[PDB]
Structures are given as C-alpha cells and as structure tokens.
C-alpha cells in the first residue's frame, strides 16, 4: 500500500471517500 | 513482617522529623511488594504511640508498648479489606472518621494505617479527602501503594510522598544466596522477575511457584514448535493467573529482545526456550501476542467477577488465529 496511507493507519486517522456524491446539494466543485 | 537491613537508613530519616515535630500528617510510601514498607510503618507507629520514647526506639515497658504488643491499643486503627472481600468499602472509612473525632483514651497520638490505598473504592477515596486535608490534632495517617498514579489525584495531592529504592543488584543477589540455596542464574532470574525487589524472589522460592513456572516453561516449549497454544490452558487456568501471564509476557519480551540483539535478558536460566521463540516467531506476531497477554492480564486484575477460563480460552484461540498467515494484527491506539 501507499506509504502515506500506512502512516495514517498507524496514526489512527481514518480516511473517508465519497460514495453517493448526488446526496450533497451544493457547488462542491470537487473536480478541478 | 521481617525487618530488612536496607530499611535502616530511610527509617533513621523519617523518625528524625518526628523528633523535631516537623512531621507531615499524611505520609504515602511508594514501594514494591516485599520491600518491607509494612515493617517501616509499624516501627513508626510503635515510636509514635510510646509514652516514654528513648532515642529513636520505643521503651518497650510503658503501657502503650504493652498494649501494642497485645494488639489492643484503643488509639491504633487499621483499614484493610475483609477476609472474603478484595476492596475497602466506604462504611469502614466513615466509621473510622467518626471515631477519630473524640479524644484519645490514653491522651496521646492517634495512628491510622491504610494497608493498601490502591484497593480503596471511589466512594471511600472521596470520603477520606475531607478528613485527610484537615485532621484533628495529634493524628497521623500512613498509606502504602505500588503505583501512585493509580490513586485519585485529589487524594494524592494531600500527602507527602516517600519512595523506597531497591538495593543494588549485586547486594540483592548476595542476600538471596545467603537466605536460600540455589544456582546464581536462578537467583538472578527470580530477582529480575520481581523488578529487583528482594523478598519477592524469596517468596517465589519458598513457595511452590517455581515448580509452576517450570511446568509453564515446559508446556510453552512443547507448544511453540507444534503451534497448539490451547494446551497452555491447564498451565494458566489458576487463581494465580496474573503472575503466570506476567511470566509469559517476560518470556516473549526476552525473545523479542534476543531477536533485536541484546546482552541482558530477564530469563537468564532458559536460553533454549527464548531461542526457540525467537526462531519460530516473527517480531510483529511476538508484539501482538505480548500486547494481547498484557491486556488480558489487566482485564483479569481489574474487572470484578470476570470468568477466568473463558478469557484464557479466548486469548489462546485468538493467538492461534493470529499465527495463521494473512491475518491483520492489532495496532495500539488511544
């Protein structure tokens, strides 16, 4: 796995990724 | 209640303050088990309750000395858990507090001794605070504990701390060899297993705990190659489970240190077992097993009414599962 992901796992920080982006109602502008 | 030689200096300090009147009304002694803190507290109590002190020692013939010898001194109070119980309740603390208000029968000092402050419940610890902060005149409190950090912060802040340092390793080894006959390696291993505190090693040797340790070592030696860790249940399921779990954790730590490369190991009398453990297990699995063993020992010592057999069986099955390839290992976290 990626080094940064392993380090975050060791630090105990969980990473969240979008699953249903249609739920959000606004100009998120995630894509650039 | 043996009087060990290394208690000579510390006593000569503490009593000196009581001779000058510069004595704190709440003294907390930090010492490992088997260090003889109880003997020191008893000597201080005998000195305080003597009606005709001479030098730094009680006369031994006054009425106070006779009552202390008989063990029926009205002004001496002891707070210890009941015979069948394991914790000290709040009712005893309240009764002692209410009894302390009235004057002493013999018109002298009043001494209260808490056998172990770590066994106090939260309610008892909170109830003791007001009495401990502003005790009545000519009242002295003595408390003993292993880890002051486990005590309540408010209770801790009201006491004067005194720490007993274990003697040097060579002196302890010589004293143990004088007391009991055994090989040098066995004495050194027993001393190191007890965090360097003499008397605890003597307690291990005088009893049958050494045979139990040998049985556990043989069982682990059989289990490590085959991989059947369940068989250790019979060697661990006992009323003294925490000590055997500590021994197993020490063996695992020694194996891990040997893998990393070190000159000192706690278990110096069993090189073969630690060598086999290092050879047959990887560092990550050793760390995971050590963490699990420590956590289970803490749970057994802390939780009240927990079932020993179920916890040990679950631990052994979990270790066996961890030994399988491709299994995610635990990671420490807050």
């Amino acid at each position: 796995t990626s080094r940064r992901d392993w380090q975050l796992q060791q630090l105990g920080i969980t990473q969240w990724s979008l699953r249903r982006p249609g739920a959000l109602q606004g100009e998120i502008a995630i894509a650039i | 209640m043996r009087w060990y030689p290394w208690l000579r200096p510390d006593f000569e300090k503490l009593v000196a303050s009581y001779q000058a009147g510069r004595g704190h009304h709440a003294l907390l002694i930090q010492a490992l088990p088997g260090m003889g803190d109880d003997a020191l507290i008893y000597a201080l109590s005998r000195y305080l309750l003597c009606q005709q002190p001479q030098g730094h020692k009680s006369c031994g013939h006054c009425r106070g000395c006779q009552l202390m010898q008989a063990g029926t001194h009205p002004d001496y109070y002891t707070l210890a858990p009941e015979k069948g119980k394991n914790t000290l309740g709040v009712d005893a603390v309240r009764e002692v507090t209410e009894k302390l208000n009235e004057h002493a029968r013999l018109g002298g000092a009043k001494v209260v001794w808490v056998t172990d402050a770590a066994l106090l419940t939260d309610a008892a610890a909170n109830a003791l605070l007001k009495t401990l902060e502003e005790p009545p005149a000519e009242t002295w409190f003595f408390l003993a504990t292993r880890e002051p950090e486990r005590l309540l912060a408010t209770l801790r802040s009201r006491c004067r701390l005194h720490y007993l340092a274990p003697p040097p390793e060579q002196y302890a080894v010589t004293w143990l060899s004088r007391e009991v006959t055994m090989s040098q390696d066995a004495l050194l291993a027993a001393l190191r297993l007890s965090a360097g505190s003499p008397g605890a090693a003597l307690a291990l040797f005088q009893g049958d705990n050494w045979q139990a340790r040998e049985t556990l070592c043989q069982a682990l030696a059989y289990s490590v190659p085959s991989g059947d860790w369940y068989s250790l249940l019979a060697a661990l399921n006992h009323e003294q489970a925490p000590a055997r779990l500590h021994w197993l954790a020490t063996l695992l730590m020694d194996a891990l240190k040997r893998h990393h490369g070190a000159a000192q190991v706690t278990n110096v009398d069993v090189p073969g077992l630690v060598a086999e453990l290092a050879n047959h297990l990887s560092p990550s699995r050793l760390q995971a097993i050590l963490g699990d063993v420590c956590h289970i020992r803490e749970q057994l010592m802390s939780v009240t009414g927990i079932n020993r057999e179920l916890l040990i069986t679950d631990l052994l099955l979990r270790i066996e599962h961890y030994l399988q390839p491709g299994v995610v290992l635990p990671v420490p976290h807050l």
Binding site: - | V303, N307, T313
Partner: protein, 343 residues
C-alpha cells in the same frame, strides 16, 4: 418409604392412610391435585381440622410445637401442612424438622410441599426418620415429548373431542404451564357445550403463556432450531431471567463442544463421550452438533460470548439480549457476516 406418581396416589389412599405424605416437585397443578385428594381422603376418615404454615427464617416454631403437643376437647384428628422454601431447608430448618418429627402423633397427619430435594437435602436426620412411615409422590411436569398424550388424556376425562391441530396448538401455547392449559380446557368446555373443539374454535380463546428454562434454550441451540430458540429467549426475557445464568449455561456446553471438536480429529467420539461423562440420552444431539459446526465456528461464538460478558460486567450495557440473539443465530447455520462479531 414408598415412591409414587400422581396417578397411583388415589390407589394408595384407598389401600390405606399413612402418617406422613411428602409432595415434592415443580408442577403446581399436580401438587394441588395431590393435596386435595389427600385432604379429601383424610376428611372422609374424620380429619375436620387443618392448619397451614410457611417455612421461612421468620417462622414461629413454638406455635407448631404447641399444636403438636396440645390435645383437643372434641375436634381431634388434626392435619398439618408445611410449605418449604424455594431454595430448600437449611441446617436450622433441618433440626427444626427433626424436632417436629420427634413430636409426631397418630392423630396428626403431616403434609409437606416444596421443590425436589437434592442428595444433600435427602441425607438429613428428619428425612431418614420418616423413611419407614412415609410415601413420596413425585410431581414433575412432562416434557414436550409426553405432553400431547397428557393433553389428550385430560381432554378425554372431561368428555371433550380434540383434533390433532388443536392439541398441537394447545401444547405450543401452554408448554411448561399445565395449570394454564387445564384452565384453558375448562374455558373451552364452558364456551362450547357440545364439546366439539376444532382448530378455529380453540385458536380464538388461546394466548401465549409458555414457561421455559435456560436448559431448554441450550438444547434448542444444540438441535439447531432457530425459531424455537428465539421464542424461548423472548419468553425468558419477558419472565425476567438473569442474563448471567444463561451465559454460564451456554458457556459450559460451548467449551465442552470446543474441546470435543479439537480432540476428535484422531479419536472416536464414543471414547470422548465416555471420558467426559456425557449422559447417554444427550450423546445423540451433541453428535449432530459436531457434524454441523466447524473449527472456524465455535471460535467466533466464543469471541462473541466473551465480548458480551465484558460488556455486561464492566460496561453495564443494556444490549445483552441483542448479542444473545445474534449468538443464537450464529450457533444455527446462518451467515452472520461478522461485522456484529467485531472480528
């Protein structure tokens, strides 16, 4: 001492009347019927005076002793009834009963009610003193296997016709509660004078009032009946049983199963059963359990049981019943995706 069942009590009473009668069991209906029969026979013999007392720590034994010692001007032939505690007699109760048995008279008829006595309770001075002049009637509730025959016989003696479906419904709804079942039969007879009890008729006037014990739940888990296990667990929760008792009862059998599964790799099952002192009747069900659960299982179950115990003990949580339901489904062959096992 004679040993009898409720059906033979009337025959024994017709044969003759003894000095003391012991009624031990867990079925209120049978105990009440035996007591009523004995008291009716005694009244026929000329016992028109009856006294009842409850055995407990706060008991006035002086009144009982005075009753035994004192005579009667005209109302002789006294009858005394004792109700033992649920736990059972203790040393103080043992010596009190010994003293009472010492002061026994031909005109005093003694009856005792209570739960079944153990070997320690059986081996008592008072119990042995009555051995030569006592008859013990055993009143145990029949199991589900023998229940339908009992229901059919009881309906027959009341001049009623029960269909098979009606009998099954009655057994299911009133399992372990014979008093409720008898009252239900009486109410059905009242409702329908013709006595024709069909399935739709009985289904209207029946409610769920079953009674169970943790051993029934463990047996259901061993057999693998999810519906029965869930129903028993719900009934136990409604009653108000202590979860710790269920946890221990399940733990014993689960650890036994784990050990047997581990050591059965290179050993026949019969030898293991003999070595572990498994009762002959149970050896059947245990066998099929070992043919339904793998080594991968019986470890997740142990982990879940340990987690539930820790939550109950240190966390004082209230979700113990949900974890019990999850474990019950796990023991039966179900997916149990393990997100709820925390594995």
């Amino acid at each position: 001492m004679i040993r009898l069942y409720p059906e033979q009590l009337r025959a024994q009473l017709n044969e003759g009347l003894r000095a003391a009668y012991l009624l031990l069991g867990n079925d209120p209906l049978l105990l009440q019927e035996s007591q009523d029969a004995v008291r009716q026979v005694a009244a026929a013999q000329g016992f028109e005076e009856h006294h009842t007392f409850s055995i407990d720590p706060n008991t006035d034994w002086n009144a009982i002793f005075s009753l035994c010692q004192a005579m009667s001007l005209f109302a002789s032939r006294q009858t005394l009834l004792l109700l033992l505690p649920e736990n059972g007699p203790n040393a103080a109760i043992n010596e009190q009963l010994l003293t009472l048995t010492g002061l026994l008279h031909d005109d005093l008829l003694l009856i005792v009610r209570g739960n079944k006595l153990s070997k320690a309770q059986e081996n008592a001075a008072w119990f042995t003193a009555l051995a030569n002049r006592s008859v013990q009637v055993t009143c145990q509730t029949p199991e589900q296997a023998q229940l339908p025959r009992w229901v059919a016989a009881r309906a027959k003696q009341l001049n009623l016709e029960l269909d098979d479906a009606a009998n099954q419904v009655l057994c299911y709804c009133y399992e372990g509660n014979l008093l409720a079942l008898a009252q239900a039969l009486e109410r059905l007879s009242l409702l329908w004078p013709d006595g024709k009890l069909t399935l739709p008729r009985v289904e209207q006037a029946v409610n769920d009032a079953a009674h169970f014990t943790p051993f029934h739940w463990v047996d259901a888990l061993l057999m693998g009946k999810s519906k029965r296990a869930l129903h028993i667990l719900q009934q136990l929760r409604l009653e108000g049983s202590e979860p710790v008792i269920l946890l221990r009862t399940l733990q014993r059998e689960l650890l036994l199963l784990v050990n047997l599964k581990r050591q059965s790799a290179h050993t026949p099952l019969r030898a293991l059963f003999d070595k572990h002192r498994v009762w002959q009747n149970r050896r059947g069900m245990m066998g099929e359990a070992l043919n339904r659960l793998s080594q991968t299982q019986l470890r997740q179950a142990v982990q879940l049981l340990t987690r539930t115990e820790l939550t109950l003990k240190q966390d004082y949580g209230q979700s113990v019943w949900a974890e019990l339901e999850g474990l019950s489904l796990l023991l039966c062959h179900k997916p149990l995706a393990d997100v709820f096992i925390d594995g």
